[PDB]
Amino acid sequence: NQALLRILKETEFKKIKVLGSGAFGTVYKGLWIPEGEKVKIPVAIKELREATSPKANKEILDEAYVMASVDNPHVCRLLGICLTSTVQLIMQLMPFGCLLDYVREHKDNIGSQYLLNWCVQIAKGMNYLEDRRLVHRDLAARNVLVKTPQHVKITDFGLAKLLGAEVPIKWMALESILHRIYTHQSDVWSYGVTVWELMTFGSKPYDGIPASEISSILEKGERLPQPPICTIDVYMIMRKCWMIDADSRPKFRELIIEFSKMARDPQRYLVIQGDERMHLPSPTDSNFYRALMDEEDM
Amino acid sequence: QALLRILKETEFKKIKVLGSGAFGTVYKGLWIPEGEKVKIPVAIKELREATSPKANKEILDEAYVMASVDNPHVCRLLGICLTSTVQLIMQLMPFGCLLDYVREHKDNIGSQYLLNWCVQIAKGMNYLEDRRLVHRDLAARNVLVKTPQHVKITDFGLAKLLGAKVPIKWMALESILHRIYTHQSDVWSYGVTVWELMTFGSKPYDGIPASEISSILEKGERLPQPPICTIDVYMIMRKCWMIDADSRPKFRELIIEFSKMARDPQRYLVIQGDERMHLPSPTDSNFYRALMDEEDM
Numbered sequence: 001n002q003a004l005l006r007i008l009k010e011t012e013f014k015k016i017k018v019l020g021s022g023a024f025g026t027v028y029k030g031l032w033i034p035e036g037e038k039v040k041i042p043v044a045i046k047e048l049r050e051a052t053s054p055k056a057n058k059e060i061l062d063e064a065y066v067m068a069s070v071d072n073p074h075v076c077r078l079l080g081i082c083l084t085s086t087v088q089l090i091m092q093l094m095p096f097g098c099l100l101d102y103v104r105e106h107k108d109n110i111g112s113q114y115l116l117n118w119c120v121q122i123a124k125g126m127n128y129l130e131d132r133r134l135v136h137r138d139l140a141a142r143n144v145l146v147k148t149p150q151h152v153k154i155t156d157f158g159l160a161k162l163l164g165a166e167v168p169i170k171w172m173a174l175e176s177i178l179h180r181i182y183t184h185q186s187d188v189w190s191y192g193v194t195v196w197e198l199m200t201f202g203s204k205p206y207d208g209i210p211a212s213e214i215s216s217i218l219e220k221g222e223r224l225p226q227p228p229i230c231t232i233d234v235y236m237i238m239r240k241c242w243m244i245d246a247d248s249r250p251k252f253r254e255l256i257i258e259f260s261k262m263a264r265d266p267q268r269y270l271v272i273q274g275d276e277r278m279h280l281p282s283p284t285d286s287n288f289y290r291a292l293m294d295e296e297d298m
Numbered sequence: 299q300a301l302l303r304i305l306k307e308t309e310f311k312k313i314k315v316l317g318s319g320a321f322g323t324v325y326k327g328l329w330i331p332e333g334e335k336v337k338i339p340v341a342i343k344e345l346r347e348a349t350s351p352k353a354n355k356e357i358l359d360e361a362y363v364m365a366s367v368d369n370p371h372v373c374r375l376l377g378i379c380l381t382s383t384v385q386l387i388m389q390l391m392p393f394g395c396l397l398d399y400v401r402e403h404k405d406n407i408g409s410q411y412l413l414n415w416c417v418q419i420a421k422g423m424n425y426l427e428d429r430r431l432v433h434r435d436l437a438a439r440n441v442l443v444k445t446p447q448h449v450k451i452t453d454f455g456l457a458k459l460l461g462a463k464v465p466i467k468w469m470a471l472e473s474i475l476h477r478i479y480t481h482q483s484d485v486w487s488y489g490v491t492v493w494e495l496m497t498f499g500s501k502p503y504d505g506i507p508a509s510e511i512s513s514i515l516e517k518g519e520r521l522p523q524p525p526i527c528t529i530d531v532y533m534i535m536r537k538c539w540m541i542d543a544d545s546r547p548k549f550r551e552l553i554i555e556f557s558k559m560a561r562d563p564q565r566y567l568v569i570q571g572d573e574r575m576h577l578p579s580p581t582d583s584n585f586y587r588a589l590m591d592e593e594d595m
């Protein structure tokens with residue numbers, strides 16, 4: 001349990017390059033230097049922007065042990081922590097980066113099979129979090145990491161203390177905006193938005209609409225529009241994720257089944273120009289990726 | 299089959315020489331997947347051997363077998379590039395080989411690590427025997443450190459290259475005299491490898507010319523007892539160097555034996571300071587695996 005979170009000293013790792021920043025911190029590519037060894041092992045380091053106290057560190061540690069305990073091929077595990085004046089969190093470095101930037105940069109080379117398999121894998125990770133009774137609270141395409149093009153994993157989940165102290169309005173369920181209710185069913189809403197981001201190849205939701213006005217348009221019944229590549233079958237799933245009654249939305253278990261069905265005949269459900277020129281990797285290419293970058297069970 | 303990737307020269311680059319052995323030169327390299335911007339570390343062995351279409355069919359036939367292994371303590375060949383020279387691709391191990399590792403940590407290795415390594419090498423060799431693959435070049439230099447807690451056997455199965463130096467000082471007597479190679483001659487090499495670990499990387503029969511090794515073995519002389527070994531450990535080595543190959547232990551038996559010793563390591567190895575030596579801890583082991591070593595153990 002406790003042994004799943006490594007407490008690091010400042011002297012055993014170094015930040016080398018900024019990768020980006022989000023709501024709560026700055027992410028670096030870093031190197032871990034095991035004590036007494038000569039190797040330098042790449043890691044990802046999130047340094048929180050606000051400094052904390054030792055008593056606040058007890059809060060951080062209690063949540064960190066939970067995020068270090070996940071065990072699922074589609075969920076990123078928190079690996080280590082360093083309690084400096086600003087706290088540093090350590091996880092596996094994903095050289096491919098997040099799925100949002102990946103779909104934007106490869107938008108002219110992504111076929112229906114990849115898109116639908118990503119939907120399945122994200123739903124599998126979210127179902128695992130629900131099984132663990134952990135609400136994500138910040139699901140979005142930016143918080144899905146690409147381990148390989150064939151294998152994505154959810155990250156940055158469970159941050160109830162950081163979000164409560166303050167928000168991704170355009171990903172949040174209406175009951176979260178209006179009433180600060182976060183459940184697995186509000187995660188289903190965020191999942192629908194994440195799917196919309198993938199199917200639009202990384203468009204910004206409600207582009208140009210101030211966040212302060214989003215709950216009003218949602219109450220009036222407006223929703224994200226049908227992506228050009230989506231058949232009516234896919235868009236109805238998205239719309240069901242955004243129903244006002246949270247208990248009427250699909251369950252992650254059901255979304256796994258439905259997107260898995262679609263992934264068995266992907267060109268019936270997504271209409272992409274060029275789709276027959278793009279396919280999943282041959283077993284040869286997948287075996288090579290896995291041996292070099294992705295040896296976990298999956 | 300799908301386990302061996304055929305690579306083109308345009309998708310990988312050699313970056314730095316790591317060293318050279320009997321048959322080639324190993325480089326740290328980079329793989330760039332087509333259509334992607336990432337650069338993925340690999341280890342590349344470029345053979346000295348020249349390449350003809352006829353030789354390439356032979357190389358490919360052997361390569362498919364070496365790409366087919368599936369065991370946590372055995373390295374798998376991953377890919378090949380057949381240009382003017384053969385280039386072989388496998389996972390890059392930043393810690394390097396176990397011989398260099400024990401030489402460099404000569405004053406910091408405890409008995410738990412040493413005996414755990416003996417267990418793991420025996421598990422990898424038992425798998426090769428299960429697959430009917432004779433190693434032919436087992437030695438501490440051909441055991442790679444994936445993490446300090448996890449080693450893997452490499453460079454096995456090279457019957458055609460060795461059949462055309464010879465590692466006399468690791469070879470069973472019947473291999474020196476007649477080029478007979480079996481799993482029981484691998485057991486002899488395993489014994490020498492354990493001796494290398496227990497001496498923290500001493501050279502076997504140091505200063506004795508290779509041409510005189512068979513003379514020394516025929517009279518009953520063997521590698522001497524390492525200072526840290528109790529008689530129980532040294533007798534395992536001596537049993538691996540019995541003249542009658544069928545009398546040597548089997549790898550399957552060595553797994554059981556060293557596993558029993560690894561459960562009480564300070565009874566079987568006497569290392570000064572052993573109680574202040576680092577042990578493999580769960581916290582460090584979970585961190586290593588997550589960062590460098592996610593395969594099923």
Ligand SMILES: CN1CCC(c2ccc(-c3ccc4c(c3)C(=O)N([C@@H](C(=O)Nc3nccs3)c3cc(F)ccc3O)C4)cc2)CC1
Nearest residue numbers: 044045046060063064067076077078089091156157161165
């Ligand atoms: C400021 N005042 C006082 C103190 C309170 C507070 C409470 C808890 C934390 C805390 C604890 C644990 C984590 C996080 C935050 C977090 O941001 N974490 C991510 C994560 O580390 N991201 C990364 N990116 C790249 C490298 S590390 C993460 C990684 C992962 F692998 C899986 C889930 C996950 O959430 C983990 C911070 C502050 C808040 C209000």
Ligand SMILES: CN1CCC(c2ccc(-c3ccc4c(c3)C(=O)N([C@@H](C(=O)Nc3nccs3)c3cc(F)ccc3O)C4)cc2)CC1
Nearest residue numbers: 341342343353357360361364373374375386388453454458
């Ligand atoms: C005249 N006539 C014509 C040609 C004949 C010939 C036949 C087969 C080969 C062949 C085929 C396959 C391999 C090897 C050699 C070999 O050296 N291989 C190692 C290996 O690649 N080492 C590495 N280090 C770092 C990166 S790659 C290796 C890697 C591994 F992961 C597991 C086992 C293994 O042996 C693989 C060469 C020549 C011989 C003589």
Ligand SMILES: Nc1ncnc2c1ncn2[C@@H]1O[C@H](COP(=O)(O)OP(=O)(O)NP(=O)(O)O)[C@@H](O)[C@H]1O
Nearest residue numbers: 019020021022023027044092093094097098142156
């Ligand atoms: N483990 C990782 N490996 C590689 N890049 C990462 C990793 N974690 C995060 N990043 C990238 O680092 C940058 C900063 O991430 P982060 O600070 O979490 O901001 P964010 O994901 O965009 N917004 P948010 O998480 O909702 O607050 C983004 O480009 C991430 O994709």
Ligand SMILES: Nc1ncnc2c1ncn2[C@@H]1O[C@H](COP(=O)(O)OP(=O)(O)NP(=O)(O)O)[C@@H](O)[C@H]1O
Nearest residue numbers: 316317318319320322324341389390391395439453
């Ligand atoms: N996958 C690998 N990752 C990192 N270093 C490696 C890898 N494979 C081999 N090396 C190192 O590369 C160097 C050259 O290896 P090699 O050419 O096989 O010679 P050798 O192991 O010393 N002797 P031999 O294999 O018996 O001919 C040695 O320092 C090896 O430890």
Ligand SMILES: [Mg+2]
Nearest residue numbers: 022142143156
């Ligand atoms: Mg994030």
Ligand SMILES: [Mg+2]
Nearest residue numbers: 319439440453
């Ligand atoms: Mg070698």
